[PDB]
Amino acid sequence: FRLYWDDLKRKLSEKLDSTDFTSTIKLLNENSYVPREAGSQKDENLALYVENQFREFKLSKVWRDQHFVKIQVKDSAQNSVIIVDKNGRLVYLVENPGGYVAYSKAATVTGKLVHANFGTKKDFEDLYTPVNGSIVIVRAGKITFAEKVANAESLNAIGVLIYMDQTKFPIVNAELSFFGHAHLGTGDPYTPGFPSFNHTQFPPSRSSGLPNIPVQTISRAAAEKLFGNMEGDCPSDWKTDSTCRMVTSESKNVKLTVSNVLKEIKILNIFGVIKGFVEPDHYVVVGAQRDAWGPGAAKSGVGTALLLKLAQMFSDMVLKDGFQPSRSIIFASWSAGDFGSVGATEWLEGYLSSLHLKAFTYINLDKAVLGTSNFKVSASPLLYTLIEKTMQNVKHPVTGQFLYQDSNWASKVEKLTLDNAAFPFLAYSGIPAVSFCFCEDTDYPYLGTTMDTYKELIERIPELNKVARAAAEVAGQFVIKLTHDVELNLDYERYNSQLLSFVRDLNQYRADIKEMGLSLQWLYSARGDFFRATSRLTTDFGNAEKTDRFVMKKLNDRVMRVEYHFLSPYVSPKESPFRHVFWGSGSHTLPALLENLKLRKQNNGAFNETLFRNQLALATWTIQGAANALSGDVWDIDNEF
Amino acid sequence: FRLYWDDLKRKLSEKLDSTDFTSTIKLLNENSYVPREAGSQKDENLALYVENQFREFKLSKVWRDQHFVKIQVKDSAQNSVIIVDKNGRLVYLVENPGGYVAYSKAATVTGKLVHANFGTKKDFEDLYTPVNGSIVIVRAGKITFAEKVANAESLNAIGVLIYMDQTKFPIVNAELSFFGHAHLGTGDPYTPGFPSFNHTQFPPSRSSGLPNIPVQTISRAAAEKLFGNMEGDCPSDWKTDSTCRMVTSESKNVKLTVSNVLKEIKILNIFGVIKGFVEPDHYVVVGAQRDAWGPGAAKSGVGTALLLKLAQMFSDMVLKDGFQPSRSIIFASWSAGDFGSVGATEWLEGYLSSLHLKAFTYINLDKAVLGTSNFKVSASPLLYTLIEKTMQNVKHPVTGQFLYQDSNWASKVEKLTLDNAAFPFLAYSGIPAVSFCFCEDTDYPYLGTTMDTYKELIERIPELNKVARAAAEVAGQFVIKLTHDVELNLDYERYNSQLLSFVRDLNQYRADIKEMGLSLQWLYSARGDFFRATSRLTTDFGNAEKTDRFVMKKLNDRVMRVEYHFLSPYVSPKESPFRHVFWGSGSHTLPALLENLKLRKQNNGAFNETLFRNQLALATWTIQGAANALSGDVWDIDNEF
Amino acid sequence: AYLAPNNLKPVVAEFYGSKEDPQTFYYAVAVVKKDSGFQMNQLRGKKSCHTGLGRSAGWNIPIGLLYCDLPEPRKPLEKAVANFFSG
Numbered sequence A, B: 001f002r003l004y005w006d007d008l009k010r011k012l013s014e015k016l017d018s019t020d021f022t023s024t025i026k027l028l029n030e031n032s033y034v035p036r037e038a039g040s041q042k043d044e045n046l047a048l049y050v051e052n053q054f055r056e057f058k059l060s061k062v063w064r065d066q067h068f069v070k071i072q073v074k075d076s077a078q079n080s081v082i083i084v085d086k087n088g089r090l091v092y093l094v095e096n097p098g099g100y101v102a103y104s105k106a107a108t109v110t111g112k113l114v115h116a117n118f119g120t121k122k123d124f125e126d127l128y129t130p131v132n133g134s135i136v137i138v139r140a141g142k143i144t145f146a147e148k149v150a151n152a153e154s155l156n157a158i159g160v161l162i163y164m165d166q167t168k169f170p171i172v173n174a175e176l177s178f179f180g181h182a183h184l185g186t187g188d189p190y191t192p193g194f195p196s197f198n199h200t201q202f203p204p205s206r207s208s209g210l211p212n213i214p215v216q217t218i219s220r221a222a223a224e225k226l227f228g229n230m231e232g233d234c235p236s237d238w239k240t241d242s243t244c245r246m247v248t249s250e251s252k253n254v255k256l257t258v259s260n261v262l263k264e265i266k267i268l269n270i271f272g273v274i275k276g277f278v279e280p281d282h283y284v285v286v287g288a289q290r291d292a293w294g295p296g297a298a299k300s301g302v303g304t305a306l307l308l309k310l311a312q313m314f315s316d317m318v319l320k321d322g323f324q325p326s327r328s329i330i331f332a333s334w335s336a337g338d339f340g341s342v343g344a345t346e347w348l349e350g351y352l353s354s355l356h357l358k359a360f361t362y363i364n365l366d367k368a369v370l371g372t373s374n375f376k377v378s379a380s381p382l383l384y385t386l387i388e389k390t391m392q393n394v395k396h397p398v399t400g401q402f403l404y405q406d407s408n409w410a411s412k413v414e415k416l417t418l419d420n421a422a423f424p425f426l427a428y429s430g431i432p433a434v435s436f437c438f439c440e441d442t443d444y445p446y447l448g449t450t451m452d453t454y455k456e457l458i459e460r461i462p463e464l465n466k467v468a469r470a471a472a473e474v475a476g477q478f479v480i481k482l483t484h485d486v487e488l489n490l491d492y493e494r495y496n497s498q499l500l501s502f503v504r505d506l507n508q509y510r511a512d513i514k515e516m517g518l519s520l521q522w523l524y525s526a527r528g529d530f531f532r533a534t535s536r537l538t539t540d541f542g543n544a545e546k547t548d549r550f551v552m553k554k555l556n557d558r559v560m561r562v563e564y565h566f567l568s569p570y571v572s573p574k575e576s577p578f579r580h581v582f583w584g585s586g587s588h589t590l591p592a593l594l595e596n597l598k599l600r601k602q603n604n605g606a607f608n609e610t611l612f613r614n615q616l617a618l619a620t621w622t623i624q625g626a627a628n629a630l631s632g633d634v635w636d637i638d639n640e641f
Numbered sequence C: 001a002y003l004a005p006n007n008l009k010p011v012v013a014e015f016y017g018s019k020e021d022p023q024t025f026y027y028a029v030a031v032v033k034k035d036s037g038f039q040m041n042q043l044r045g046k047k048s049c050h051t052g053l054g055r056s057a058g059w060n061i062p063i064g065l066l067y068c069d070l071p072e073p074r075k076p077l078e079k080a081v082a083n084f085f086s087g
C-alpha cells in the first residue's frame, strides 16, 4: 500500500502515547552513570549502554567512532581566591571553588578588583574606572564565558571571577559551584582545522581562542564576602541586587590562584542509521549530548532520553508498521559537548569530504525541556516555513492551544550562539541546522551545576512526561516531513528577506559610501539577482512532474546547495573556520562589514578604508555568485549587457 | 539507426578529409588582423569575426563576456642599457631594445654583471661568484621568465637581462628582440583571487608574486657586445657559443633603465555551446588563445583555426549527420592569453560557483603544431587511459604508422608548466585537463618575437595541413569519447601509481622519520585505503546495469569528484590559489614535503621541523580523506578497527 | 502534457458549432435520472460516472466545484473523492 502524511502523523501519535520518558530519565540518573565528565569510565559505560540499545532496536547499521583529544582537568592542589591586605601580614580567604573553568591558565596573581556588568564590550566602554592591571568580576549569563574572558583580555586585565546573582538566577543554596569552557571558537583547540584522529600523529599547534589569563567561577556567597570589602555603588540601570559594589577599597586587594592540568582522553561517538528506499545516501543527522559535568539531567539527560525513544519509534515504524523513508536518518550520541562541543566538531572536521553536499539537515535535541511556558526556536532560514507548519500541528502540553499563537515570529528568532551544539554544522560545514526549547522567560538556574538533577528538575516542571511527549512530537514532525516525500521542504525563499534587511541597513550609510567615491548600485543588483534566481527556481518546480524522479533530482540538487554557496570561498579554513557570510565570525561576514562602516562616522581612526574596499568587493561578489549558481546553467546567466 | 563508436569515428574522418586549415591560417594572418596586442583594436575585429562565425555555424547558444584588466605597456621614454665606469663619465651605448618584459618594475640601476646558464635553482650554487649586489644575465629557455626573476630576486640581485644564444635558438638574424610576462602565477594580478568585473568595484590589492626588480630583454648582437667587455669563460657543461663570459672587468659597470607604465584595457572572451540530450548541464570545455604580441601565426592563429574548424565539424555533425552527444560542449576563445593567460583565470574566478562539479574536462588546442617529429602530451592522469586509446587510432602525418609506438610513456610525461593555459584549470579548479603538441626535438625558435609570421611557419613545417589535420583528429577523438556514451572515460585507477610513487619516494627517508619519533606507517595505510577505494568503485561499475540511468548517474557523480577531493581544504584560495596537493605551487603540496624532509640530511640548520610535522599531518589526512570519499558512504567505512 | 520532461504544445484546435459561426468552447453539464429528488447540495454518497481522471468536463470541473466541501485529508484527491462518492 502507501502511507500519506495525515495517516502518518496519526501513526506517530499512536506510537507516542505509549512510550514513557520519565523512567528513562530516572535511568540516566542512577548511581551507575551519574558523574560523567568526558573520557571518564561512566561515559564509556553509558556509551556501551546506548550502543547496546541501537543494536536491540534493530537499526540497519550501528557503528562507533573514537578519537583522542586534549581537555583540561583539575589539579590535585586546590585553587583558591584569597583576600590580601596591603600590609602583607594577615591573609584572609574567601573560597576554595569546587567548580573550575576549562582551558584557563595555570597562574597566580594579586591586584585591584573592578566590577563589570556582564562583560559586554559596551559595558567595558561605559565604565568610569580604568580597567587595566586589575582583576575583574562579572555575572554569568547573556554571553558565553569565552567572550567575557575575550573582552577582559582585550582590555588588558589580569583576572576574571564569574558568579551568579539572585536576581537573574533565583536559588536557595548560596554555596554552589559550576562550570564552563573558556575557548573562543569550538572544537579541540590543540588541533584546529584538521581532525583529532590518530593519523595526524598530533603535530604541535594551538588555537587562537585560548586566553592567557586565569578564569575562576565563584558562588554567590563568595561574592558577598568580596562585596563586603568593596565600595562605590552599582548604578541603578543594572537590574541587580542591593549588595554589589564597583571597585575595591584602596587597602585590600584580592589574590586569584588557578591551577589546572591538561589531560589527553579518549572520546567515543555512538551512531546508528536507518536506510532509505529511493535515495539512501542523502541523510539527515539527529544528535544529542551524552555527558555533563555534575549529575547532569537538564543538559545531557533529556537529550539522550529523547534520542533513545525516537530511535525506538522510527525503527519500530519502519520494521513493524510499514513506513517507508526515502532518505537515511543518522541518530548520534557524541560525548564532550561541554568543552565547546568537540565531539561534533571533530567529527565534521573528520569526514568533511564524505558529507560534502550529502547531509542536508541537522536537528538538535539538546536542552529541549527547560521551561513549560514558551517555545523558542533558532534555525537556518531554509527551515523557517518548515517550523511554521509544525507549529500549526503540535498542541501545547499545559494548555490546549496550538504553538502558532504569534503570526509574526520570524523577526524574534535569534541567530545560533556559539555555546549551542548546532553551530558548527551551520557555520563551519554548511548544513542547515535547527534547535528548539520549551524555555521559561528567565533561563534555567542550575544548568551547569552540581544541583542539576532529576529531583529538582521534577520540582520545577511538575508534568515532565507530557512536555517530553510534545518535544519528541515536534522532532517527529521534522524528520517525517523531511523524509517521506520526494520534495524537500527546505524553503529557499527565506534568504531573500535577509538580503533585503542587509541592503536596507546599508542605505542609511549611502551618504558616507558616496563620499569615498564608490557607488552601492552593484549590491542592489546582487539582491535583485538572488530574487530572480529563487523565483525562477519556484516556477521550475511549478512545471515539473512529481512522480518523475530524474527531473526532480536535478531540481533538488539546486535546493541542497543554496546553503553551501553562501560560505565564503575567499578565506582559509584553518585561520578562521566559520565561513558563512551571514552567520559567521571574522572580517568576512556581513555584520562585520556594517560594524566596520559605522566607525567611519565617529572619526576615531579605527576604520580601515582599504579593508572596507576589499570587504565590499568580496561580499558583493559572493552574493552575486550565489545568485548565478542558483539560476540555470552558465549560458543562461545574463550579463551586464 | 543509432550511431556507435565505429560509425562515428569514420564519420569524423570523412569530415576531416574535406576541410582546409591552411586557408584559415592565412585568413587569421591577413593585414587587417595581424598585430594583436591585448585589448587593442585589432583584437576586436577578430573577436567579432569569431563570434560571427560561431553564430554562423548554428551553435545552440553563442555568448560573449567583457571585463577590464591592467596590463603594462611601453612608455614614451625608451628603456635602454649602457656601460659605465665607477664614476659614470665613461659612456658607451650598447643598444635600445624594442621588446620589453611586462610586469617588470620601473627603475634605473647600475652594477657589475654575473652570468647564469638559465637561472635554474640548481645553478646559483654551481655558480662560482656571489650573485648579490649585482645585475645578472640569464639565457632564455627551459623555464618561465617568472621563475628566473623569482630565483635571482630570491638571492638579492638587482636586475635581470635576458638573451637568446645561437646554440639553443639558431636564428640568422642577430637583431631580433622579444617578449614575455613576469608574473609568477596566472591571471590579472591587481585582482588576486576575485574577478575583474566592474561589479567588484576594483579595490586596491596587489598580488604577492609580482617582482621588485627591473627585467629586460636584449638581442643577440646586443649580448655579444656585453660579452666583449666581460672577462672569463663558461663551463663546458653549458652547451653554448664560444663567446660567453662570466663576469665584468673590475673598472667596468652596467646601467640599465626601464620605464614601463600600466594601462587599463578591455578583455573579451567569446563562447559558444552545443547542448546535450541526456545531461545538458555537464559539459566539456575546449579552448584557444586569441592574441599574441607579434603577428602571432604559431601562437594564436593555429589554435583559433583549429577551434573554428572543430566548431564547424561538430555543429555540422550534430545538425546534418545525426550525432547525439549526451553532454554539452563549450567552445571558448580567450584573450590576453599572453600576459599569463588572464582571460581564462578571470573567467574561472568569475564563475567558479557555476562550474562546481559541472565541467569535467578542458582540452587545450594552443600551440598544437610546432614541428613534425614527436608527439608530446601533458595531462591530468585521469585522461591517460583515454590518451592510450587515442594514440592507437591516430596515424602520424608523415609515416603511416600509429602514434602509440612506445609502450611505456606514462613515466616520460612531464607535469603542466605554469605558462600553459590548462594549468589554472587543473591546478586551480580541480578539473582534469590536457594539452598536446607536435613538438620538434628543439623548440620553435622565434615564438614570442616579431619574426613569427605565416610564411616562416610554412617554410619550417612544409606540410602544415596534414599536421593540423592530425591534431584536429586527436581533439575530435577526445570530444567524442567523452560525450557519446553513458560511461565517462575518466580512468580513476591511474592515481594509484602516483600515490605509490610518492610513498616509494618517502620510503628512503624512513630512516630519519624514525629518528624524529613519528612513524610513517599511517601513510602506507592511507595509500592502501585509496587502493581499496578504487577497487570497490570498479566493482560497482561491474555490477550495475548499463541501460539504466539513475544508478549510472549516482556512480558518475562519484567519479566526477575524484579530482575535487585532491584540492587541499586548509589554505586560502585568495592567498595561495593552486591548492592541488599533487600538481600545484605552495608549501602544502607533496614535492614541498619531499624537499622539506630532504633538507634535514644536509644538517644545515635550514629545515623547519614544526612545518614538516604539520605538513605530514595535513598530507596524510588529505589522502585518507579522498579514500574515504570514494568508498561508499559514512557507514561503510571500514574505519580504525 | 506540457510538464517536464514531456514539454508539449497544442498545435491545432477544433471548433464545435456550425461552420458559419465557429465556437471554440464547450459547456459542462451533470446529467441525472428523473424523479430522484437530490440537489447539488444533498449529493453526498450517491454513485457517479465520470469520463476520466483529469479530463476537463469530467474530473476538474465537477470535483472542482465541490472539493472544498469535503473534509480533510484533502490530498491525494482521489482518496477523499473516493470517500465522498460511494461507488
Ligand SMILES: *[C@@H]1O[C@H](CO)[C@@H](O[C@@H]2O[C@H](CO)[C@@H](O)[C@H](O)[C@H]2NC(C)=O)[C@H](O)[C@H]1NC(C)=O
Binding pocket: A068, A198, A264
Ligand atoms: C593512538 O594515539 C594514542 C595517544 O598516544 C595512543 O594511546 C596511548 O598509547 C600509549 C602506548 O601504547 C600508552 O601510553 C596508552 O595506551 C595511551 N596513552 C593515553 C594517554 O591514553 C594509541 O596507542 C594510539 N593508537 C595506536 C593504534 O597506535
Ligand SMILES: *[C@@H]1O[C@H](CO)[C@@H](O[C@@H]2O[C@H](CO)[C@@H](O)[C@H](O)[C@H]2NC(C)=O)[C@H](O)[C@H]1NC(C)=O
Binding pocket: A608, A610, A611
Ligand atoms: C587595515 O588593512 C590593511 C590592509 O592592507 C592592513 O595592512 C596590511 O595588511 C596585510 C594583510 O595582508 C599585512 O600582512 C600587513 O602587515 C598589514 N600592514 C600593516 C602596516 O598593518 C592593516 O593591518 C589593517 N589594519 C590597520 C589597523 O591598519
Ligand SMILES: *[C@@H]1O[C@H](CO)[C@@H](O[C@@H]2O[C@H](CO)[C@@H](O)[C@H](O)[C@H]2NC(C)=O)[C@H](O)[C@H]1NC(C)=O
Binding pocket: B068, B198, B264, B265, B266
Ligand atoms: C566599469 O569599469 C571600466 C574600467 O574601470 C569603466 O571604464 C572607464 O570609464 C571611464 C569613465 O567614462 C573612462 O574614463 C575610462 O577610459 C574607462 N576605461 C576604459 C578602459 O575605457 C566603466 O565605465 C565602468 N562602468 C561600466 C558601467 O562599465
Ligand SMILES: *[C@@H]1O[C@H](CO)[C@@H](O[C@@H]2O[C@H](CO)[C@@H](O)[C@H](O)[C@H]2NC(C)=O)[C@H](O)[C@H]1NC(C)=O
Binding pocket: B608, B609, B610, B611
Ligand atoms: C618555521 O615554521 C614556523 C611555524 O609556522 C614559523 O614560526 C612562526 O610562524 C608563524 C605563522 O604561523 C609566523 O608568525 C612566523 O613565521 C613565526 N612566528 C614566530 C617565530 O613567532 C617559522 O617562521 C618557520 N621558519 C623558520 C626558519 O623557523
Ligand SMILES: *[C@@H]1O[C@H](CO)[C@@H](O)[C@H](O)[C@H]1NC(C)=O
Binding pocket: A130, A132, A133
Ligand atoms: C594602566 O594601569 C596603570 C596602573 O598602575 C595606570 O597607572 C595607567 O594609567 C594605565 N594605563 C592607561 C593608558 O591609563
Ligand SMILES: *[C@@H]1O[C@H](CO)[C@@H](O)[C@H](O)[C@H]1NC(C)=O
Binding pocket: B130, B132, B133
Ligand atoms: C652581499 O653583497 C655584499 C657586497 O656585494 C657582500 O659584502 C656580502 O657578503 C653579500 N652577502 C652574503 C650573504 O654573502
Ligand SMILES: [Ca+2]
Binding pocket: A187, A188, A191, A192, A193, A194, A195, A196, A345, A346, A349
Ligand atoms: Ca580538530
Ligand SMILES: [Ca+2]
Binding pocket: B187, B188, B191, B192, B193, B194, B195, B196, B345, B346, B349
Ligand atoms: Ca582575479
